[PDB]
């Protein structure tokens, strides 16, 4: 129910060094 | 036996 | 993992460790999918051809780690096995199909900013997110490389998921369905991979649309770390959905 969520990143808006390399992919 | 060692009350 | 990259303290709270007792030493990763469940490679409990059938007295669960060696104090936890559930029909005769298995863990553990589930996907996110060409996050304390030796933290390396045709050609194994290959083409010009310490390590794809991590596949089995004209094979996790609900909607 809360899971996928990271405590120190998605709750805390913020992002990973390299997770938009992700995001941009999914073109 | 490179790692560390971990607390008997796991094992 | 090869050619990836030192992790952020709490990039991965769901990575799991499988230390064996004795002697204590790394065997595979695993991710946490509930709270008293965890998730890993099927041949990293059953393999016969290496006399490998450890029990679940056999080895520890280690959540909330960064460091490969140390006893990470105050952050990690170390739970025992209850049941190890395999899935019935796990061919680790021919190609390790339905490389999928379960832990039950005695005592359910306590989230923190370290330690935190991933989710399962379902018909719908699997249904877009799983796409050649789309990128896939690895993460592991496996070797460097084929042949330093061994990261001091956990890696992280996010790869490429290849077409279908393009695994098959690349191996001379007959690829089921319950497993897709990610990977570099020998002239993308980028490298990584996964490799020997990664089996049962998680393989996410954070969702664009919830924010949230979803587990695709599982780390099984490859053929040379980030060997050219090669890719590595996981579990096509969403597939035995089926078996994983049932499992855990009934012990
Ligand atoms: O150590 C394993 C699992 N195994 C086993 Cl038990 C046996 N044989 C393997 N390779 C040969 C191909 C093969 C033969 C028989 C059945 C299935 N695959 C293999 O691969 N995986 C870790 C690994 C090392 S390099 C590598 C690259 C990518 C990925 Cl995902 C995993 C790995």
Redesign the pocket.
Known sequence: ADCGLRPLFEKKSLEDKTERELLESYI | GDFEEIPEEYL | IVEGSDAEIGMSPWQVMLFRKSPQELLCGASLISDRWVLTAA?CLL?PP?DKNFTENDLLVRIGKHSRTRYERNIEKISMLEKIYIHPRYNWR???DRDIALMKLKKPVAFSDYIHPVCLPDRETAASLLQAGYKGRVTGWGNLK?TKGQPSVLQVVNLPIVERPVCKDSTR?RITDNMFCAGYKPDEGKRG????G??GGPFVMKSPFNNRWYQMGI???????DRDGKY???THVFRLKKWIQKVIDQF
Not at chain 3, 193 to 196: F, L, Q, R
């Open positions: 041949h393999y290496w021919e190609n390790l084929e194994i991979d996964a490799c020997e990664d089996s780390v099984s089995w490859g053929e040379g770390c590595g094979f996981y």
